[PDB]
């Protein structure tokens, strides 16, 4: 039987695909992540800060 790739197939989303967490995903640190300043961060007073000298 034709063992080739069957170029005419269904190129779509396959909606009934496993919609779960993929336990084997890369558990590492992702070095290529946004190293910037996070301009939208908590600008408040941080009440739990060092209350000593």
């Amino acid at each position, epitope marked *: 039987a034709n063992p080739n790739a069957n*170029p005419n*197939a*269904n*190129p*779509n*989303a396959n909606p009934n695909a496993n919609p779960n967490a993929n336990p084997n995903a890369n558990p590492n640190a992702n070095p290529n992540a946004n190293p910037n300043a996070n301009p939208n961060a908590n600008p408040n007073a941080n009440p739990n800060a060092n209350p000593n000298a």
Partner: nanobody
Amino acid sequence: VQLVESGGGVVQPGRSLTLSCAASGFTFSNYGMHWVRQTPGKGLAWVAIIWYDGSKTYYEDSVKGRFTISRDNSKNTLYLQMNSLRVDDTAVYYCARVRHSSSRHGSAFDLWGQGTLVTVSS
């Protein structure tokens, strides 16, 4: 739903041209898209396919190695980068969306664009 291309114009033989195809009104990252020519005096002719991911691709036998199709799901676009254009490639290029099918044999092109005219001459 809407499917509008761009990037047409006139270039000389041997030069390179890149077409774009912006998809609006529907989820673009779920559909495998096509590119179709229409040379005046001839019927439509298929050009390339993109497999919903960029993982798999197929081309017409006469455009292998000169046309490269790739898609950008984050911006809902297609790109058929045409290299080494010839006087043959004078045609109107359409986009096509592959209809959803409850099988594994695909389906027909249900959403077509308005086409961009590409002219190759000197």
